Design a protein around this motif. Sequence first.
Motif, PDB file in Angstrom:
ATOM      1  N   UNK A 235       0.825  -1.187   0.000  1.00  0.00           N
ATOM      2  CA  UNK A 235       0.000   0.000   0.000  1.00  0.00           C
ATOM      3  C   UNK A 235       0.878   1.264   0.000  1.00  0.00           C
ATOM      4  N   UNK A 236       0.472   2.331  -0.686  1.00  0.00           N
ATOM      5  CA  UNK A 236       1.093   3.659  -0.667  1.00  0.00           C
ATOM      6  C   UNK A 236       0.777   4.435   0.622  1.00  0.00           C
ATOM      7  N   UNK A 237       1.633   5.433   0.942  1.00  0.00           N
ATOM      8  CA  UNK A 237       1.358   6.306   2.090  1.00  0.00           C
ATOM      9  C   UNK A 237       0.058   7.058   1.874  1.00  0.00           C
ATOM     10  N   UNK A 238      -0.145   7.607   0.670  1.00  0.00           N
ATOM     11  CA  UNK A 238      -1.348   8.374   0.412  1.00  0.00           C
ATOM     12  C   UNK A 238      -2.585   7.504   0.564  1.00  0.00           C
ATOM     13  N   UNK A 239      -2.535   6.282   0.026  1.00  0.00           N
ATOM     14  CA  UNK A 239      -3.690   5.408   0.156  1.00  0.00           C
ATOM     15  C   UNK A 239      -3.949   5.070   1.625  1.00  0.00           C
ATOM     16  N   UNK A 240      -2.885   4.921   2.413  1.00  0.00           N
ATOM     17  CA  UNK A 240      -3.083   4.673   3.834  1.00  0.00           C
ATOM     18  C   UNK A 240      -3.761   5.864   4.485  1.00  0.00           C
ATOM     19  N   UNK A 241      -3.317   7.085   4.165  1.00  0.00           N
ATOM     20  CA  UNK A 241      -3.963   8.260   4.778  1.00  0.00           C
ATOM     21  C   UNK A 241      -5.445   8.325   4.402  1.00  0.00           C
ATOM     22  N   UNK A 242      -5.775   8.001   3.147  1.00  0.00           N
ATOM     23  CA  UNK A 242      -7.148   7.982   2.672  1.00  0.00           C
ATOM     24  C   UNK A 242      -7.965   6.988   3.480  1.00  0.00           C
ATOM     25  N   UNK A 243      -7.478   5.742   3.549  1.00  0.00           N
ATOM     26  CA  UNK A 243      -8.259   4.664   4.160  1.00  0.00           C
ATOM     27  C   UNK A 243      -8.373   4.836   5.659  1.00  0.00           C
ATOM     28  N   UNK A 244      -7.272   5.260   6.295  1.00  0.00           N
ATOM     29  CA  UNK A 244      -7.298   5.491   7.728  1.00  0.00           C
ATOM     30  C   UNK A 244      -8.185   6.682   8.078  1.00  0.00           C
ATOM     31  N   UNK A 245      -8.181   7.749   7.264  1.00  0.00           N
ATOM     32  CA  UNK A 245      -9.075   8.871   7.537  1.00  0.00           C
ATOM     33  C   UNK A 245     -10.541   8.413   7.469  1.00  0.00           C
ATOM     34  N   UNK A 246     -10.865   7.556   6.501  1.00  0.00           N
ATOM     35  CA  UNK A 246     -12.241   7.052   6.414  1.00  0.00           C
ATOM     36  C   UNK A 246     -12.615   6.246   7.652  1.00  0.00           C
ATOM     37  N   UNK A 247     -11.719   5.333   8.072  1.00  0.00           N
ATOM     38  CA  UNK A 247     -12.002   4.506   9.240  1.00  0.00           C
ATOM     39  C   UNK A 247     -12.181   5.362  10.487  1.00  0.00           C
ATOM     40  N   UNK A 248     -11.327   6.384  10.637  1.00  0.00           N
ATOM     41  CA  UNK A 248     -11.414   7.294  11.788  1.00  0.00           C
ATOM     42  C   UNK A 248     -12.773   7.959  11.840  1.00  0.00           C
ATOM     43  N   UNK A 249     -13.223   8.483  10.698  1.00  0.00           N
ATOM     44  CA  UNK A 249     -14.544   9.120  10.657  1.00  0.00           C
ATOM     45  C   UNK A 249     -15.598   8.111  11.056  1.00  0.00           C
ATOM     46  N   UNK A 250     -15.504   6.878  10.544  1.00  0.00           N
ATOM     47  CA  UNK A 250     -16.580   5.922  10.799  1.00  0.00           C
ATOM     48  C   UNK A 250     -16.618   5.527  12.279  1.00  0.00           C
ATOM     49  N   UNK A 251     -15.439   5.322  12.891  1.00  0.00           N
ATOM     50  CA  UNK A 251     -15.389   5.057  14.335  1.00  0.00           C
ATOM     51  C   UNK A 251     -15.980   6.236  15.099  1.00  0.00           C
ATOM     52  N   UNK A 252     -15.496   7.447  14.809  1.00  0.00           N
ATOM     53  CA  UNK A 252     -15.956   8.614  15.571  1.00  0.00           C
ATOM     54  C   UNK A 252     -17.461   8.794  15.484  1.00  0.00           C
ATOM     55  N   UNK A 253     -18.032   8.685  14.279  1.00  0.00           N
ATOM     56  CA  UNK A 253     -19.480   8.869  14.127  1.00  0.00           C
ATOM     57  C   UNK A 253     -20.246   7.800  14.850  1.00  0.00           C
ATOM     58  N   UNK A 254     -19.811   6.545  14.714  1.00  0.00           N
ATOM     59  CA  UNK A 254     -20.571   5.464  15.325  1.00  0.00           C
ATOM     60  C   UNK A 254     -20.535   5.610  16.836  1.00  0.00           C
TER      61      UNK A 254
END
Length: 106
Positions: A1-20
Amino acid sequence: MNDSEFHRLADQLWLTIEERLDDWDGDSDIDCEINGGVLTITFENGSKIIINRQEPLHQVWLATKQGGYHFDLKGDEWICDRSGETFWDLLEQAATQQAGETVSFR
């Protein structure tokens, strides 16, 4: 995986955890906070669940009362390196255990 793709995917997961977690409306008091980028979930019995990025490894790590679990992205999901279990299955099982109440986002 690329660094940028990691930032993308981790940012999505963070939002989903925080909202839930911030949307949680069960009987139990459950709080989620972000400190230095690390998410900590705290339960009424004083126990915690901690979720953090391991950026050079492109992994997400999970620490619960019962253990530690390191996740890689495999076919669009975060998967535990040791067991193959998914991030959301493990997080829901631990939160349900630590709250004493079903914590489910399916």
